[PDB]
């Protein structure tokens, strides 16, 4: 049938199903309600940076419409909602003065979610560093971010933690490091060539290191001050796309494993084992920061669960590892991504050029984490696909490809869980069509259609698929 034998009975007892948004992508009221600017506000308001010079000033206006959106997610039989708190909406300058109107918004949101029986899963950070912190401290280049983030996290735990029991610190630090500091295509637009300055060979590693230290510090604060009373959990969200060896050659198998290590091992080896992957230590050498023993012990075991954002897969082709002059994090891997095997593409692309529809990548990623890292508790924190711009409403609603996407990816996830993977939940990116970073409003990831002229919500076929699949 159209569910393909999927239902709540097909997953573990108490398995959590949710949808996901992030603050800047959906909230709107970017310069209102006392919110201070983030690095994304400054970036998106610069001509040329975003498709059509668009920005998140209004976005989906969830700020005003949150009760409509919560009613909708409940009507679709979800158990949970992953959203993020905008740091600069709480602390307009990133430190010091609290914006009480901002606090009130998140209180109202959290309270309504709970009233409607939806569990809040709350991200502290989703790319939206307060602009004041970027200017004053140099953002994630500065080790002082650990202190600054911890104080912000402390406030959130104190203010919301009696109700919020499921936290995440960061979202995809790999992408911040890569796009913000290697390629320089996301704020702060740093890179070797870039006008803002930077160094693609060193800064991504500094930034990743500071994310890990900041995460660890915030979790240490949670555990020592709040956890006894609040009895919640704190994790982190990491992107992981699957890498499959192009052939069974030694070089190609090594390349696939090297890619896994530079992609997910970069964060998981510190979080699980207390060190960076050996291959990164060997290849990146002096450009890879060293944890002190005390720091490594703070970082190891500091995630109660691992959020994995899983979208896609590629093949990897290898070659002889060679001595080379350092140029970038990306070039450090010494691999070649390949998107076809035996003359056939790995999968068709969704609207985003990077997003190949490869359901077996979900199995690959989950099974790999199970086998490599001692089967830690995993939550699939994002999974989804996008439609292009300029379709009619009815074309958006008839999202047959997305229905197929979810049925196939969830079937592969089920396969991994049935084989013993410790997966505790699954969250669809996204509840709503939203502001998709560089793509602005030209990329539509929602299971619910948003008319960006009127702001009206209309559930797509995929929303009704979930409703049918998830009926209690
Ligand atoms: O976009 C939807 C949603 O997803 C979350 O973030 C997305 C980013 O928006 C997107 O830019 C990012 O793109 C990745 C892509 O997934 C990777 O497959 C690719 O990986 C490279 C690797 O870096 C290379 O070194 C290697 O050689 O090749 C591989 C494969 O080509 O890199 C690109 C970036 O350049 O994907 C993210 C998810 O993975 C956000 O959380 C959410 O807010 C977004 O709305
Ligand atoms: Zn409004």
UniProtKB/Swiss-Prot annotation:
Recorded catalytic activity of this chain's protein: Hydrolysis of terminal, non-reducing beta-D-glucosyl residues with release of beta-D-glucose
Any Gene Ontology CC annotation: extracellular region
GO molecular function terms listed in the Swiss-Prot or TrEMBL record: amygdalin beta-glucosidase activity; beta-D-fucosidase activity; beta-galactosidase activity; beta-gentiobiose beta-glucosidase activity; beta-glucosidase activity; beta-L-arabinosidase activity; beta-mannosidase activity; cellobiose glucosidase activity
Glycan attachment residues as annotated in the record: 248, 390
Listed EC numbers: 3.2.1.21
Keyword Zinc (UniProt): no
Presence of keyword Hydrolase: yes
Disulfide bond sites: 191-194
Residues annotated to bind a beta-D-glucoside: 25, 126, 171-172, 311, 382, 429, 436-437, 445
Result after altering residue 241 to V: Increases KM for substrate about 5-fold
Pfam families named among the record's database cross-references: Glyco_hydro_1 (PF00232)
Chain ranges passing through the membrane: none
Positions of the catalytic residues: 172, 382
Keywords associated with the record: Disulfide bond, Glycoprotein, Glycosidase, Hydrolase, Secreted, Signal
Localization terms from the record: Secreted
Family: Belongs to the glycosyl hydrolase 1 family.
Function of the protein: Hydrolyzes p-nitrophenyl beta-D-glucoside, p-nitrophenyl beta-D-mannoside, p-nitrophenyl beta-D-galactoside, p-nitrophenyl beta-D-xyloside, p-nitrophenyl beta-D-fucoside, p-nitrophenyl beta-L-arabinoside, oligosaccharides, pyridoxine beta-D-glucoside and the cyanogenic glucosides amygdalin, prunasin and dhurrin. Possesses pyridoxine transglucosylation activity.
Assembly notes: Homodimer.
Record's protein name: Beta-glucosidase 7
Organism of provenance: Oryza sativa subsp. japonica (Rice)
Name of encoding gene: BGLU7
């Amino acid at each position: 049938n159209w569910l393909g034998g999927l239902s709540r009975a097909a997953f573990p007892k108490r398995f959590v199903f949710g949808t996901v948004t992030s603050a800047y992508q959906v909230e709107g009221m970017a310069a209102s309600g006392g919110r201070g600017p983030s690095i994304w506000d400054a970036f998106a308001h610069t001509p040329g940076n975003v498709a059509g010079n668009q920005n998140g000033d209004v976005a989906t206006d969830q700020y005003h419409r949150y009760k409509e959106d919560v009613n909708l997610m409940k009507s679709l039989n979800f158990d949970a909602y992953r959203f993020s708190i905008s740091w600069s909406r709480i602390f307009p300058d990133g430190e010091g003065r609290v914006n009480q109107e901002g606090v009130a918004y998140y209180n109202n949101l959290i309270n309504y979610l709970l009233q409607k029986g939806i569990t809040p899963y709350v991200n502290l950070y989703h790319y939206d560093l307060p602009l004041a912190l970027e200017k004053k401290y140099g953002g994630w280049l500065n080790a002082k971010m650990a202190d600054l983030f911890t104080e912000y996290a402390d406030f959130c735990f104190k203010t919301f933690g009696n109700r919020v029991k499921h936290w995440f610190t960061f979202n995809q630090p790999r992408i911040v490091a890569l796009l913000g500091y290697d390629q320089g295509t996301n704020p702060p637009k740093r890179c070797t060539k870039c006008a803002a300055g930077g160094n693609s060979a060193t800064e991504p590693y500094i930034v990743a290191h500071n994310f890990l230290l900041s995460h660890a510090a915030a979790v240490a604060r949670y555990r020592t001050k709040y956890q006894a009373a609040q009895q919640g959990k704190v994790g982190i969200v990491l992107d992981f796309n699957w890498y499959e060896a192009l052939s069974n050659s030694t070089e190609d198998q090594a390349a696939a494993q090297r890619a896994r290590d530079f992609h997910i091992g970069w964060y998981l080896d510190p979080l699980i084992n207390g060190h960076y992957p050996q291959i990164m230590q060997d290849l990146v050498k002096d450009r890879l920061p060293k944890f002190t023993p005390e720091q490594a012990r703070l970082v190891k075991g500091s995630a109660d669960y691992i959020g994995i954002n899983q979208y896609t897969a590629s093949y990897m082709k290898g070659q002889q590892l060679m001595q080379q002059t350092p140029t970038s994090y990306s070039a450090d891997w010494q691999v070649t991504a390949v998107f076809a095997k035996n003359g056939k593409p790995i999968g068709p692309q969704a609207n985003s050029n990077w997003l190949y529809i490869v359901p077996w990548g979900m199995y690959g990623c989950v099974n790999y984490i199970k086998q490599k890292y001692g089967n830690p508790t995993v939550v699939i924190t994002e999974n989804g696909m996008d439609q292009p711009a300029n379709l009619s409403r009815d074309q958006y609603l008839r999202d047959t490809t997305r229905v197929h996407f979810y049925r196939s990816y969830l079937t592969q996830l089920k396969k991994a869980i049935d084989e013993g993977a410790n997966v505790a939940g699954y969250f669809a990116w996204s509840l709503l069509d939203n502001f998709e970073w560089l793509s602005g409003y030209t990329s539509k990831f929602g299971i619910v259609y948003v008319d960006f002229n009127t702001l009206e919500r209309h559930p797509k076929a995929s929303a009704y698929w979930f409703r049918d699949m998830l009926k209690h």
